[PDB]
Structures are given as C-alpha cells and as structure tokens.
Amino acid sequence: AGNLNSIFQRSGRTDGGDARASEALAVFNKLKEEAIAQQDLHDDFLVFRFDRDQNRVGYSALLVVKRAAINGQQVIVTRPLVMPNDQITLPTKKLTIQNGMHQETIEAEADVQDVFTTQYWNRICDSIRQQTGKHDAMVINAGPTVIPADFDLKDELVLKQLLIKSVNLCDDMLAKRSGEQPFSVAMLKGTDETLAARLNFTGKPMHDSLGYPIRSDILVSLNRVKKPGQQENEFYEAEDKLNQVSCFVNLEYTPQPQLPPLTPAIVITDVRQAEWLKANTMELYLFALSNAFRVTANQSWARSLLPQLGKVKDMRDIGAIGYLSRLAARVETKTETFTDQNFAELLYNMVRPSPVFMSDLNRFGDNAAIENVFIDALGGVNQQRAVAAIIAGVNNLIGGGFEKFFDHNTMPIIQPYGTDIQLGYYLDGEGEKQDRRDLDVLGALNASDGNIQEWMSWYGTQCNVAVHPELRARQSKNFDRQYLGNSVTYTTRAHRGIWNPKFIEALDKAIASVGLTVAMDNVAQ
C-alpha cells in the first residue's frame, strides 16, 4: 500500500499541500526575494515545500536548502521548518503504561520529537532530491525546528531572520564538511589581548528566534578579547563582547542519609556568540560554556536569589524558602527589618555550598545542529561518536591536551537528569509572555501559599521518574492551570543533563593553561 508510492509518484504533478505549508511557502519565497533585493542574502540556493500529501510525514515543513559539491560528493544541508496546523490532527500514538498489576493506555498527539523519526528525515532527504535533481546527494541535518501553529504569519521580520539564521548554519555545515579551520584560543590570544567577564543580574527575559521568552536569572557576558594601548580601528563604535551564556539557578529539595537541604542547580538555558560573528560551530559553543562555570567558580551566583525588596509581586521571593526549612513559614521579607545578613543566614541553613552544572539540550532549538551532538553524547547507539566529536571540539580550542585532565571513556561528557522539560510560556497581568519555568521551587511554594502537601505533590511529580512521563506531564499541566493560570501556551519540549565535573575541569583549566587569561570584572562583591 505504502509501496505504491513507487507508482503514485512516477509522473506528473498534483494540486495539494495544507493551508499553512502553502502560506508559509508563499511568505518564505517573498522574503527570500526581498533579502536578495536588499543585498542581505546571496542568491545561491533554494526554498522547498515538503508536503504531507505528496510524501511520507505527519507534519509538513518548509526546507531551507543549500548545496555544494565537496571533493566530488554532492552535499546538501537542510534545516526543516515544521508547520503544525491547528486544523489537522495526526492519529495519536498508544502509550501503554504498566502500572504494576494495572495496565492502562493513554492516547496522545505526536510532538516534534515523536514526528521527527529517523524515517521522517530520510523522507525529507528523498523529497529534496526529487526537487533539486541531486538524486545521488548526501544530506546534512542542520536540525529541524518548528514554527508553531498559534501566531499570525504576517511577521515578515522574524521570518526573514529565520531564513538568515538557517542559511548561516547551512553554510557552516557545508564548510565544516569541507574541512574549514576551527575556532581556537590562539585566534583570541593576541600577544597584546586579554579577556574579562561579568555576571548580569538582568531583571528581564531573553528571546529565541521566534520571539518566545527563555528563563535566565544571570546572563554571563564574556568581554571581547583586547587591551588598552592597541591600535584603534579607525572611527568605530562597537560593543566589547565575544559571547554569552544564559542560565538560572533553582533550589532543588534533595535527599541526604552535614549538608543543608537545597541544591544550587545551575542550569544553562542558552548559549550565544556575539551578534557580530556569523558562524555557529562546536568550538564556539564549547568555549562559551566556560562562562557558566565561572558563575560559581570565581563569582557568587547567590546574589540572584535576593528577593526583589519593595516589590509586592515577587512570585519567587526567597521568603518562601522558610516553608521547606524548619520554620514552616514564609520569612518576612516585606519588612524594613529584613537584611542582607538575614538573607545570608537563610541560605547558610538551607542551600548547599557545592554548585552543580547542568544544561538544557534541545534537538529542535535554535542551536539544534549542535544540541544534537550533546544529546547523543548522553547515551544510545552513537554515544561514543558524539563524545568523540565533543572532545575533539575542545582539543581544537586548546591545541590538544583535554585528555591530560581526564578519561572521557570513564567519564562520559553529559549525564541524563531523567525528569525532562516541558517548555511554554504564560501571560502576565499586562499580557506579556513569560517563561512557565517561573514555578520553580520558590515559585511553587509561594503559589500554594505554604501548603506543603500541595507543593510536595507537585515536587514529586517533577522528581520521581519511575512514573511514566505522560502521567507526570498531565499533572504538571493540571498544576499550571491551578497555580500559573489558564493563559498558558505550551511549546517544544527539551532534555536536560548534567555536565561531567571532569569535563568542566578540563575545559576551564585547559583554556587557562594555554594562557587565555580572563579577568573578573566583579573583582570583589
């Protein structure tokens, strides 16, 4: 039946494609042409519609496609843009859950993680070959992403930017397949140049390529490598930035058989190079990750936990920590008698001194071509290859020697966190988009106003991973409706993992050990 595609597709063309993939193709072709007209985009490539009608996927997508022949092989790099359609329902999957002696099945919709199967990709490749004529071409996966059903398609600015970013990545991957030279400390280490860095206690969120908010408590900014006394580059003005890492810190309530009860879980939510640089490679990513390490290694992250004193509406007010402590009460942090010293004491008794470094990993994110190696490095059939790629990336940064710090085959680079991440946003009182991750441990304690039993039910939902994830997802959504509100939109899900402490030691020390010295701007607190 599915093998009749061999007859169905032999000749001719048809009238088809869903309403969103149709509209999306039309706007993306318009944007391509305007970008060429303004000379922002080069006219060396093609945009294609992938149909659920003409070919074998549940979800249609547009394909950002670039090509070159590399050493005789035709190579195509594709960055799919999934187009979910609110009016189209793909048949659901049966989730059978063996609840001890009780067996029950939950049916559920396929998300981009379930949709982007290995065959989904292979079908994308085949269609491109039909559309490009390159039937013997190899196709590079730049990472599928999704442009969600919900918003109006008239945002030409964002859509233009999506094409720009997607072609950037396509050029990188053709280049890196072509053998292009890597990013390294040697390029930064001018004989007359040094690095410096600071922690930004932002007070604001940051936004992905489609404009959705990303939680961050601290933005780590690594300054441009340079030195006073160097030749000024004519009449210029520039931001002195090299890269940045977005992160936040939760306070996880963790077991112990003497440590205090909460863990300073430092979570990377995003990794970006400064906007003036176009390329996106593993070496650039890996180098930037050292920015999160310094958050607790040299500086002190705990300043981010200070309550917004004077602000009534602080949903994550530290005062909530008193509900997990022996007080079983909110600390009065509204008062003129609440001091910096009292804050430090709450933490002395409640929060552990040893930082833990972890990060999100998203196969469908803005950095998916790279996120995918870090995800496969967690485990599975190609873990060894993904790990080899990552250690090679750091060695490219330092000129070898990562191996002088530890054995990557005894110490895999990233461990699973188990509980995965539901992403989404909610609207605040003025209708702005805010990250749903705000109901973190302090957030949830204030949301239940001290009802510890309600908190613990939620907390167990977010921690006990012997419970099938569908059951956990349903309870997590039930809790958002009661505590966050009904104005909640869900977005593409993501993985989380723990960076191996030895990977971290080797990355940070190896860079410092080759002389790429970085000064702290916050010289003392």
């Binding site: 982007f116 290995t118 996966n141 397949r177 071509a369 190696v373 496969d376 599975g380 190609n382 993904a386």
Partner: peptide
C-alpha cells in the same frame, strides 16, 4: 531510561 537517536550528521 533509554536514549533514542535521530538522523544527526556532519559530526558522524
């Protein structure tokens, strides 16, 4: 508990 792998490329 298990890790699925999609069709990644370039690095392998």
């Amino acid at each position: 508990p298990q890790f699925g792998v999609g069709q990644g490329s370039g690095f392998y």
